[PDB]
Amino acid sequence: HHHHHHGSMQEVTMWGDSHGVAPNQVRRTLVKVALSESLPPGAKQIRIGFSLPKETEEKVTALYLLVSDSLAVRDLPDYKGRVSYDSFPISKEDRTTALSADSVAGRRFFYLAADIGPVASFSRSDTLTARVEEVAVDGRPLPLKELSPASRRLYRGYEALFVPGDGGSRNYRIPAILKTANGTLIAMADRRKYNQTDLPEDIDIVMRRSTDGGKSWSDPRIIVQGEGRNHGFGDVALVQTQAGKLLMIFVGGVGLWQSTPDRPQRTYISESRDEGLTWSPPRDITHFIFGKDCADPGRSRWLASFCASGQGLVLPSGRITFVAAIRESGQEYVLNNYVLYSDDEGDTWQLSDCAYRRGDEAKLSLMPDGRVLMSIRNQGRQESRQRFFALSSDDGLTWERAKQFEGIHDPGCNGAMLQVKRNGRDQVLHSLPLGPDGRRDGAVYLFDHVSGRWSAPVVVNSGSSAYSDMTLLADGTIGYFVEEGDEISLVFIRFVLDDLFD
Numbered sequence: 001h002h003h004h005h006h007g008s009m010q011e012v013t014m015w016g017d018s019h020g021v022a023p024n025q026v027r028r029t030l031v032k033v034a035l036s037e038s039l040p041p042g043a044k045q046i047r048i049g050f051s052l053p054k055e056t057e058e059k060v061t062a063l064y065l066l067v068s069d070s071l072a073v074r075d076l077p078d079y080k081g082r083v084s085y086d087s088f089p090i091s092k093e094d095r096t097t098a099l100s101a102d103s104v105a106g107r108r109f110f111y112l113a114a115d116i117g118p119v120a121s122f123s124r125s126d127t128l129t130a131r132v133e134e135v136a137v138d139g140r141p142l143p144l145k146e147l148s149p150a151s152r153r154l155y156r157g158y159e160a161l162f163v164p165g166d167g168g169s170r171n172y173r174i175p176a177i178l179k180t181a182n183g184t185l186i187a188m189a190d191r192r193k194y195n196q197t198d199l200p201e202d203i204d205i206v207m208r209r210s211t212d213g214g215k216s217w218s219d220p221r222i223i224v225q226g227e228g229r230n231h232g233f234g235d236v237a238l239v240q241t242q243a244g245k246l247l248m249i250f251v252g253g254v255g256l257w258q259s260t261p262d263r264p265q266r267t268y269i270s271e272s273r274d275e276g277l278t279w280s281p282p283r284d285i286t287h288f289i290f291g292k293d294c295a296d297p298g299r300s301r302w303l304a305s306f307c308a309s310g311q312g313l314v315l316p317s318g319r320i321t322f323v324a325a326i327r328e329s330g331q332e333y334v335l336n337n338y339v340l341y342s343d344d345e346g347d348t349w350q351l352s353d354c355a356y357r358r359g360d361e362a363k364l365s366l367m368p369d370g371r372v373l374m375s376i377r378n379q380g381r382q383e384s385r386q387r388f389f390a391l392s393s394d395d396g397l398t399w400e401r402a403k404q405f406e407g408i409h410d411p412g413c414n415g416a417m418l419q420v421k422r423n424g425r426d427q428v429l430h431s432l433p434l435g436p437d438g439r440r441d442g443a444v445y446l447f448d449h450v451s452g453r454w455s456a457p458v459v460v461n462s463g464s465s466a467y468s469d470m471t472l473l474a475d476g477t478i479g480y481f482v483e484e485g486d487e488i489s490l491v492f493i494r495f496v497l498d499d500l501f502d
């Protein structure tokens with residue numbers, strides 16, 4: 001029938017790759033090919049024919065056939081040897097290649113990979129592609145099931161900073177990026193050691209640093225170690241204060257909806273005075289926000305609070321701010337937003353007036369005229385499934401809803417904003433998944449302050465895409481730090497605005 005009964009039906013499945021790439025990167029997958037079964041014992045060779053346009057050929061320095069017993073999602077070097085593979089060189093002018101079945105040694109997964117040269121142009125049109133045209137065993141072709149085209153966009157930088165398996169952690173989630181005044185880059189993450197689930201699972205906070213603008217990164221270091229279920233840590237947000245100290249804020253303990261006034265999920269801060277090399281022991285500041293030890297009786301029966309992961313905002317006055325999403329009642333799964341802020345470099349903390357009813361993870365950015373813009377995640381598919389916005393003209397103390405900023409879809413995800421100037425026009429860059437209604441196709445949009453209108457989205461990384469954080473580098477490049485894949489890797493991408501929009 002569909003399944004015949006005259007022998008073993010070998011089936012070949014073939015995926016083109018669409019992850020970003022950057023110049024001078026080695027062994028980047030263009031196409032992956034999987035056999036459903038091992039080559040049979042009587043088989044002597046497998047031959048793979050492929051096409052590759054001249055514009056791609058002009059941008060690579062070498063080609064390879066990689067053979068592995070594992071089927072990997074990312075480029076094989078991204079797994080740092082945790083995926084063992086053999087590498088068989090191909091001349092860049094060649095369009096076929098063959099391997100003995102002994103060389104293949106029972107393995108089923110084949111990768112057409114390339115070394116990328118020192119490319120000069122990064123426009124939207126500059127993408128690498130290849131196609132596998134033939135797979136034959138003992139000179140007999142097999143039917144190829146093609147499941148996606150190859151299209152790898154060239155970016156000025158592109159690096160997976162945290163990949164499932166790294167350091168023994170099974171998974172990673174929740175990206176936070178910070179550029180300090182001296183130019184250092186701090187990237188932090190949930191080290192989701194056993195699986196991808198949120199607190200109250202056992203989770204660590206891990207960090208990597210770069211002192212050359214993201215060209216190279218230090219070995220990952222665990223900053224805060226989880227100590228078991230209900231005793232992990234995660235959801236980091238970062239700022240640098242006016243005095244120059246770095247500050248991280250994070251939660252730990254039970255899950256968000258399990259937190260109670262008397263047994264809370266706690267909020268901690270830790271600071272660094274040396275550009276992220278060393279960090280102070282985490283200090284519990286839960287008592288400034290809610291619960292049993294809170295000095296405000298009106299908030300002592302609040303149940304939960306957490307600041308949105310990524311970055312806060314330090315205002316021109318030196319006021320340090322993070323938006324907290326707070327659970328006020330145990331009868332409902334509903335959060336309200338309040339700005340958590342300090343006017344004494346983190347010694348004490350206060351709460352603004354309520355900024356958003358039925359909000360979720362929220363971010364802040366500084367308007368050109370000095371007002372503060374809040375972007376609030378739409379949780380629970382409220383209203384028109386749009387992202388929510390609010391404005392404050394008193395440095396974050398009081399707020400009004402700002403529907404004139406609404407206009408982009410939010411499938412219910414954390415994202416980030418940057419205030420940017422383009423062609424003399426003040427604008428806000430906003431990162432979110434495009435969806436629709438799913439965490440797919442990581443996108444950026446530009447909102448024009450003066451016309452009150454949003455651009456069409458530009459997809460930065462197609463495929464599964466979730467939380468993102470953004471920072472401006474000293475030289476005008478943008479650093480974009482996104483959750484890629486269903487099993488997430490945290491990826492740091494660098495571009496200028498013209499690379500995406502004009």
Ligand SMILES: CC(=O)N[C@H]1[C@H]([C@H](O)[C@H](O)CO)O[C@@](O)(C(=O)O)C[C@@H]1O
Pocket residue numbers: 174198199235251255256306360361379
């Ligand atoms: C402290 C905490 O629970 N943070 C988590 C939040 C909240 O659950 C929602 O924002 C509440 O609505 O969202 C995630 O689950 C998500 O949506 O990927 C991941 C993140 O770790």
